[PDB]
């Protein structure tokens, strides 16, 4: 109800939405596998506020 874009975001947007980024479709994981190190060192690039 801002109207200000704020990137504090109620994890309720994660449950609502959280319907696109469950995907039947590509369940045949096009990256993980094999690009396993590839994902992995992405870690290492990579770094959320709120995470790690």
């Given at each position: 109800?801002?109207?200000?874009?704020?990137?504090?975001?109620?994890?309720?947007?994660?449950?609502?939405?959280?319907?696109?980024?469950?995907t039947?479709?590509?369940?045949?994981?096009?990256?993980?596998?094999?690009?396993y190190?590839?994902?992995?060192?992405?870690?290492?690039?990579?770094?959320?506020?709120?995470?790690?």
């Open positions: 109800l801002q109207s200000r874009p704020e990137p504090t975001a109620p994890p309720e947007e994660s449950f609502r939405f959280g319907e696109e980024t469950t039947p479709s590509q369940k045949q994981e096009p990256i993980d596998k094999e690009l190190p590839l994902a992995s060192l992405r870690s290492l690039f990579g770094s959320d506020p709120s995470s790690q």
